[PDB]
Ligand SMILES: *C/C=C1/C(Cc2[nH]c(Cc3[nH]c(CC4=NC(=O)C(CC)=C4C)c(C)c3CCC(=O)O)c(CCC(=O)O)c2C)=NC(=O)[C@H]1C
């Protein structure tokens with residue numbers, strides 16, 4: 001359901017965090033437009049008094065010698081008097097949208113950047129599992145701008161997610177597993193994160209600094225601050241960090257192969273401005289955690305599912321050295337079930353079902369086969385919820401939560417079914433998940449929580465996943481019968 | 483092993499590069515021992531002299547201050563009065579080796595490194611090929627190194643290689659798709675190069691500078707320069723360089739899962755010296771693109787299995803729809819001969835066989851299974867020189883030159899089979915391959931072929947190799963047949 005929580009724009013609010021400068025430009029012969037009410041304190045002359053007038057009479061020679069490499073490169077460092085801000089410029093609704101914002105004072109990005117990477121590459125990064133690859137990234141990021149807590153929120157099936165990492169300092173608090181809503185990182189803001197990686201909260205305590213004039217004439221609405229460098233997050237959100245205990249939040253959204261995945265949150269007690277160069281060079285590492293995952297699952301599967309095929313190679317030679325189904329299936333029944341980490345498996349070979357392992361009762365399975373053949377799957381049908389699809393076997397979960405249809409022939413409702421049982425799973429949650437926001441009596445403008453502390457729910461009457469292998473190994477048996 | 487090549491003790495041969503200095507520090511109260519002649523270019527007062535003499539008492543105030551940090555971390559910025567060197571160390575052979583050699587002049591090296599780390603990582607990497615993956619790392623290490631010429635070398639099965647890639651400037655002779663031995667980078671140096679990636683040969687033409695006392699006092703044989711940098715090499719190496727038009731060297735070891743997948747050599751038309759932060763920065767780039775293309779191997783594997791399944795999904799419905807095999811194999815005759823990507827199949831499912839593609843005769847089919855029972859193999863026999871191992875039916879250059887066994891029945895003479903033809907594959911041999919290196923009347927000392935010109939080896943009659951996933955679509959077919 002689209003919510004007042006997800007219908008809400010970003011991109012086109014009010015403007016930029018109180019530490020940049022947006023000086024706009026409309027068409028040919030340069031010429032300023034949408035400015036930034038804070039502009040008369042890093043320039044030299046007030047905003048309203050150069051909102052009509054061209055670049056010649058707005059910027060100093062510095063940035064106007066640099067104007068050419070700017071277009072031509074992306075960003076470009078200029079050391080004009082207040083210090084040495086950035087330059088990052090893109091294209092908007094009809095504009096050249098030049099902004100600067102402070103630059104990096106240490107000459108050990110390059111140096112600390114290159115020792116920090118080596119960690120999250122190495123001669124062989126996967127050694128002691130994937131809680132390391134998650135934990136070294138989360139570490140580095142922390143130990144590459146400095147922070148007092150950072151994790152790896154991962155989204156799942158229903159876009160709700162949890163933190164599989166945690167790097168911290170001498171006795172804060174901090175989350176870990178600890179599920180928290182999907183409403184949070186809403187539909188708006190991972191549709192937008194496919195194209196725009198990271199966001200900087202500079203000083204979550206401090207207030208947003210408007211834009212000039214609040215619309216960009218021609219269009220009618222305000223400016224697309226979407227590709228922005230310093231978009232200011234939103235009331236729904238800082239209302240919702242001033243509880244938590246962040247004066248920051250440093251995110252760099254993952255996506256190895258076009259698909260989102262997680263984030264790396266970075267938290268910090270006191271306002272903190274990491275740079276564009278450092279912001280982007282941890283985007284380089286978020287880009288090295290997404291890759292080295294791609295590589296190992298895309299591997300695991302390869303290395304894991306040989307163990308699968310050595311089952312099916314057992315199950316097939318026995319199958320042809322004394323051809324006799326029931327006899328040869330019994331001895332290699334530990335193998336059948338174990339194809340798929342299963343407890344039970346019926347087979348309909350024409351005659352009566354050969355129930356085999358630790359399955360439910362025959363009178364039951366007969367009703368289960370009619371109900372199947374009167375469903376659509378072109379070959380297979382599985383679920384981790386069971387009672388949800390075919391309620392009759394709800395009550396007797398304990399062996400019946402997840403199944404593998406594998407139609408042996410067309411009209412023939414002969415097949416085999418793999419019963420997979422029931423799993424505990426006491427599952428932690430940051431405040432009661434049943435309610436992830438705060439309606440003000442009319443329900444039109446709302447709030448977050450001030451909650452964030454371990455309300456457990458208990459996933460149960462579900463099972464395990466059915467990961468490409470079960471559903472693939474299993475389709476080996478069905479071609480191995482015909 | 484064999485000819486004088488896999489003999490040359492290429493770490494105990496004294497000698498060291500002349501820009502560098504490797505001196506050695508023996509015993510407890512850090513106390514000199516072996517110093518590398520030209521050591522008074524950096525200490526005014528002679529090597530000969532202070533082979534006695536405590537550590538700090540032989541080398542400067544400057545460099546003493548920073549004797550502390552390089553124990554802990556082992557790379558310092560000791561900046562002295564002769565363009566300030568820096569010394570990486572390591573403990574070779576029970577004593578401590580300080581390896582004074584030059585700076586990075588230029589403070590981008592790191593900031594530039596980091597940006598070519600991006601070009602070869604940006605999350606659409608390989609979307610004009612693996613080929614394009616190799617030919618980036620070509621132009622990126624090149625930019626790091628200046629070096630006029632970069633290469634990339636895979637060591638195909640028999641240790642002897644190809645140069646997939648290249649990356650030259652203009653009017654630069656080059657081996658684009660050219661092809662040569664693995665005598666060269668021999669037995670010795672593969673074994674050494676698993677242990678350290680890199681090696682430099684900057685001023686090839688520059689003869690070595692002895693390091694006294696020819697042989698390490700209490701051992702004999704020269705110290706052991708194995709895990710040094712500013713060493714030299716088996717002389718008659720930069721030997722077969724003066725036979726080229728190169729006066730430098732840089733070549734890394736791409737290591738992929740711990741086997742040596744080869745190296746990238748950048749050599750220069752005239753001498754050049756790159757740093758040890760700078761060569762760290764390309765050894766870094768090797769253990770990165772390996773991380774990438776390890777995934778790309780794993781990827782097009784899982785994409786090609788999941789392919790073959792879908793192909794076999796169809797196959798086994800033609801199976802279950804009825805008709806006996808011979809009728810089912812009629813059209814799927816087309817589909818099975820595409821299931822190991824071979825020309826035809828032959829059943830032999832008891833009775834007189836099925837020839838059912840572009841097969842040899844009936845009489846030669848049977849001639850194999852006779853012999854195929856004599857020799858080993860539980861389940862399989864994929865060979866490609868099916869005429870070397872087995873001459874009689876070793877003239878089929880057209881119909882069969884690589885066969886595939888499977889036993890449809892354990893201890894029984896029932897094997898189904900897919901033969902596939904000779905394929906002419908033009909090989910642009912670079913120099914003579916009947917001349918790795920012509921010796922001196924004596925056969926006691928070797929210098930190496932002085933002519934690297936294209937040679938034709940048009941190899942009549944083998945198979946396109948037997949790719950894992952292909953190969954792997956056999957244990958199944960055999961299970962889902964009786
Ligand atoms: C329903 C509307 C609401 C909004 C709007 C809104 N939500 C977000 C996202 C968000 N929420 C979190 C919470 C959080 N604390 C942690 O420790 C972690 C990781 C472990 C998380 C995810 C985060 C981190 C985020 C976005 C990541 C970030 O802070 O950069 C946004 C994103 C701001 C944007 O526009 O980019 C917005 C606009 N917040 C609500 O509570 C509801 C009402």
Ligand SMILES: *C/C=C1/C(Cc2[nH]c(Cc3[nH]c(CC4=NC(=O)C(CC)=C4C)c(C)c3CCC(=O)O)c(CCC(=O)O)c2C)=NC(=O)[C@H]1C
Pocket residue numbers: 485486487488490492633665666667668670671681683714715716718719722731732733745747918919928929930
């Ligand atoms: C029969 C004796 C022979 C030896 C002994 C030997 N040579 C080397 C050095 C070597 N060779 C290669 C191969 C190679 N890399 C390239 O780029 C090219 C041309 C494109 C070639 C042909 C390499 C990489 C090396 C290491 C240094 C270098 O090549 O730049 C060794 C080990 C090297 C060392 O001394 O440390 C040994 C033991 N080599 C022969 O070719 C024959 C004559």
